[PDB]
Ligand binder design. Structure first.
Ligand SMILES: [Fe+3]
Ligand SMILES: [Fe+3]
Ligand SMILES: [Fe+3]
Ligand SMILES: [Fe+3]
Ligand SMILES: [Fe+3]
Ligand SMILES: [Fe+3]
Ligand SMILES: [Fe+3]
Ligand SMILES: [Fe+3]
Ligand SMILES: [Fe+3]
Ligand SMILES: [Fe+3]
Lengths: 98, 97, 97, 97, 97, 98, 98, 97, 97, 98
């Protein structure tokens, strides 16, 4: 997993502003990995009760992506600009728009 | 991470009833790992806005543990009995209930 | 494995209250992995004696899940609340109880 | 790394629409990891020229996040809704908008 | 962990006799790793209740070592002979018995 | 592998009593892994010379299991008791006597 | 991934001259891994819009290889010589040159 | 390591042209990792004989980077263009050439 | 570890001559790793009995290196030539023989 | 890979004599892994130019094994004796002499 075994944790000082941006990106990584995991599980579950819960949990992890992204964009103005630039590049090359 | 790179996925058959139990346990593993991760992040985040969201997300992951646990207990009657036995064992050794 | 090579262990101070909650979740992770491992081994073991022991050991690991979860719930009141909430959500969405 | 050693690639059929969503999330994972890597490197680089390139490359990886995100949102309408809902949740709990 | 993600399990045929010996050794590996994990956790746990349960679970994993060992020795006569030889080698070199 | 890259080793003090037990369990893990590796290799080697040596090396690793086990049992009296208890549990459930 | 979880970052000194070389090589590793990942994804994407973006991002990662290579060559004169020597060896053995 | 355990190799088809590019990039990855490894070892080796060999081997691994690079550039014309573009970008941003 | 979980072993055909060379190199890797592990353990073991067995086992693993090396050299004549060439290069650069 | 991310390197003291033996064994491990990697790549490369370079590089890694082995044997006298003992054991069991 991504969490650290407490036996190995010997950090005492709080995150710097830049490390705070990094743990937000890592939190998004964790959520995206969880979404992929549950979507994959749902694909092979012919038990409709298990599939329904897997898909509903995955939906809630997608909201977690939004929460961590809102914090990241607030702390990373460069990401705001480049996110818009990335959207524009996709539009120009493919026509896909929000 | 725990999810598989789709390039490597070649399975076609659906999960067996035994495999359904195993992915539910793996789903609980994933949630418990996420809780530890966000609780650790919150511990070192002095930005109170970031800490607040980390702890609120962690709270929602704890509910996900319950959802998967509920499905597992419904499909694993042995886990229901042994969960009770484990609770009783802790009570007899420590008094915690 | 999940245990640390002692060559790398240099921590000398005890777990904080929050770290105590994290090692209990990690202990549950270890037990859930062991259950999956032994249930998988039993599936492919045509030796009935080996299968019988694998399933009996797995049963005892399921009790270990209960023991660690009893401690976790005692130290994590939020997990108690969210566990019930998770059970209720599955009930509302699937009827499973 | 995240890429597969071609020696292990036996897949011959194209990604399903569900797998397409998954590789887009994995691409975002790869970009976010690269940003963290280069931002961390720049922190410890006293060589001003190396730092400047590290930060400029990281900036360009942030645009890649946007490109993959645009594709993901176009194929994952649920993510569009939950992204909005996630933004609103942060705004309510912290005022960040 | 050591258990396989069911998404990746495509084996259908049962373990051979030689593979049965290998999974028993792997089961012993899993138990020994769990013992080390729980013994390490107990070392840093000031909560006497958590320490008591950690040590009692670890004790039960030591019994699992015996169960898997008994099956392995029953299926691996070479291991029986070499176990004795290993005990004797330690005797001649250290006096430990 | 299981060994540590010396670049990362910064420990100076010797193993405690419990750490000595843990490295003995880790040594057994390494031996059992090596046995499985060489038995697997021998299974697919139709070169009789390679197979013969793989099986002979594997036999000697099984003796290493005994050596590390002897030290572990001498330092871990709880393991002595539970090992006997484990054998009896197998006997009660299957009749096997190893 | 290759980035470190900030929870484990306890380094305070800046990189030495030799370490600067090593992180530039690691940056090239990260870029080459990303190129392989996106090229592999593009191979199995039947969605032409997705494939188009994957290939364009991969192209931009190839430019990042050049950026990190330029810095590395400026700091590693031995790499300059051996790069030329490596090019020459391929010439003599295969005739490939450019 | 990066090499595959032959027990797991079941591929029969030769590499495609795309896969050939990918294994060349992976070969470069292996060489760059070896260079970092030996450079790190040499830094902490007080034995001047060991240091001398480590640096001489690392020098030869740097030539291997050139060999694999030459093949890659010959098969990946896009990499030729972007390599020059990357050089130019560094010149514009830092003055390095 | 280096051994494969039998659940994942789907191979049915024997090793090719090239694969035999590769598993011999992998066997040497396993032995060298074991030597480093036990040599490291012996370093921090003030229990003289434990140290004495660790060093004696490590000695026996060093003989295993020779056994696998003899087979490798017998199947890899190129390695014989390059081994001697490597010895001569060290002699030329350091005088060690 | 086997190299350490410099962000995690905090050792400020040279290798002991025992650690020097360990990094030489680790260097041999790295070379043997590279040989296996390049031998495997050459197996699937029907491009004869790429195959030729893969095999020639692999040949040079085999010389690196010899260089590191020479240093190890010079610093590890037990390995010299046990290497001879291993060769003799193989000759006894198979008749192979190397
Ligand atoms: Fe989540
Ligand atoms: Fe969750
Ligand atoms: Fe257990
Ligand atoms: Fe990118
Ligand atoms: Fe157990
Ligand atoms: Fe051994
Ligand atoms: Fe890039
Ligand atoms: Fe090389
Ligand atoms: Fe050995
Ligand atoms: Fe080399």
């Amino acid at each position: 997993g991504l969490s650290i075994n407490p036996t190995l944790i010997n950090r005492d000082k709080p995150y710097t502003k830049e490390e705070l941006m990094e743990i937000l990106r890592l939190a998004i990584i964790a959520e995206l990995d969880a979404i992929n995991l549950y979507e994959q599980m749902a694909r092979y579950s012919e038990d409709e009760n298990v599939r329904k819960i897997l898909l509903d949990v995955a939906r809630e992890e997608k909201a977690h992506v939004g929460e961590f992204m809102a914090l990241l964009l607030n702390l990373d103005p460069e990401q705001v600009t480049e996110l818009k630039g990335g959207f524009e590049e996709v539009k120009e090359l493919t026509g896909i728009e929000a």
